[PDB]
Paper text:
PfpI is a ThiJ/DJ-1 family protein from P. aeruginosa that was previously incorrectly annotated as a protease. In summary, our data show that PfpI is a GSH-independent methylglyoxalase. We hypothesize that the primary function of PfpI is in the detoxification of electrophiles such as methylglyoxal (MGO).
Given that the predicted molecular mass of monomeric His6-tagged PfpI is 21.2 kDa, these data indicate that PfpI is likely to be a globular dimer in solution. Purified PfpI crystallized in the space group P 21 21 21 with two molecules in the asymmetric unit. The structure was refined to 1.4 Å resolution with an Rcryst of 0.254 and an Rfree of 0.274. Each PfpI protomer comprised an α/β sandwich containing eight β-strands and eight α-helices. PfpI and its close structural homolog, PH1704 (a protein with proven proteolytic activity from Pyrococcus horikoshii, and which shares 43% amino acid identity (E = 5.2 × 10–38) with PfpI), both possess a “nucleophile elbow”; a distinctive strand–nucleophile–helix motif and a common characteristic of the “α/β hydrolase” protein fold. In PfpI, the nucleophile elbow is comprised of residues 108-118. The nucleophile itself, Cys112, forms part of a constellation of putative catalytic residues, which includes His113, Glu22, and Asp86 from the adjacent protomer. The residues flanking Cys112 (Val-Ile-Cys-His-Gly-Ala) are broadly commensurate with the consensus sequence (small-x-Nuc-x-small-small) conserved in all α/β hydrolases. The X-ray crystal structure of PfpI was similar to that of YhbO, a well-characterized glyoxalase from Escherichia coli. Mutation of Cys112 and His113 in PfpI led to complete loss of methylglyoxalase activity.
Author numbering:
A (entry chain X), B (entry chain B): 2 to 179
Write the structure that this text describes.
């Protein structure tokens, strides 16, 4: 079984993130030996959601403003339409995603989460999947939208919905290990 | 002031629409003498939301499947991130908006509601505003995004947020009268 001991992943979330899109990948990554930190726009706690109902609050380990991608081997971008619509316009979240591309570090994204990638200018020429509502936005941004349980372009790992999470986790672990 | 007597407006909404972006314009049009029909994807009731909480239920006058634009002088597209994300993929909602473009009928859209126009191919070469989170999607789809309280491009009337509603209402009434 692949070990990710020593690996640190940053999950980028604002209030309204799909809770399982963080906790599923977080548990799979922790089971393999990695550390996962939660970064948000504000300090304190960030609220996850189960579909259209608010769910549990999670302790924020750090802010986008304060984060350095030197400290992380990869980014996790959970969906949640509310979180995804909010986070995509945040300059420091965009900067983290841009720095990950420049540094050839994995970015795992799921559901509505690729809006951050569109707005950071990062989907042009890349193949990814997403929740189908984002298909037009990704294609209009220059992306190559495909319908796959888990898409991979280099170290860009993408999935469309919560049911994809098990395969998403397995592929993200393979890509993080290299 | 301006009478809209004899005019009929279809508001296209799904569950999770921003309630005031329906009720505010609806009252203004009705005060002006117009009739406002609430159309949804499903019969019965459609759930309005107040920001991030579901709110009151509204009677559905007709479904997108059954609707003809022959019976409406204009479309009203309230926002709400949940509604706007859902409604954009429904071909029958896209059809109603395309028929509006083809028949030179006003379309008033606010906040997140322009996602449907993007997916219907209707923002190409158009000038419009929106909630800023859609800026990149509107520009990537060939639109010209502007930051105005109420933007107008022909009969396309667009606003950004609930505080724009009074001006949105006043402009819509003007465009509807012609």
């Amino acid at each position: 079984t692949q070990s990710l001991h020593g690996k640190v992943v940053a999950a980028l979330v604002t209030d309204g993130f799909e809770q399982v899109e963080l906790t599923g990948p977080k548990k799979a990554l922790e089971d393999a030996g990695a550390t996962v930190r939660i970064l948000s726009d504000k300090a304190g706690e960030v609220r996850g959601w189960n579909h259209h109902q608010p769910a549990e609050a999670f302790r924020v380990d750090g802010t986008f403003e304060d984060a350095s991608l030197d400290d992380y081997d990869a980014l996790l971008l959970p969906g949640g339409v509310i979180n995804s619509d909010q986070i995509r316009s945040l300059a420091k979240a965009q900067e983290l995603a841009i720095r990950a591309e420049q540094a050839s570090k994995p970015v795992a994204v799921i559901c509505h989460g690729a809006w951050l990638l569109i707005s950071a200018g990062l989907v042009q020429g890349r193949t990814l999947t997403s929740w189908p509502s984002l298909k037009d936005d990704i294609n209009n941004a220059g992306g190559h939208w495909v319908d796959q349980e888990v898409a991979v372009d280099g170290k860009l790992v993408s999935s469309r919905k919560p049911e994809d999470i098990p395969a998403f986790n397995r592929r993200f672990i393979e890509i993080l290990a290299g």
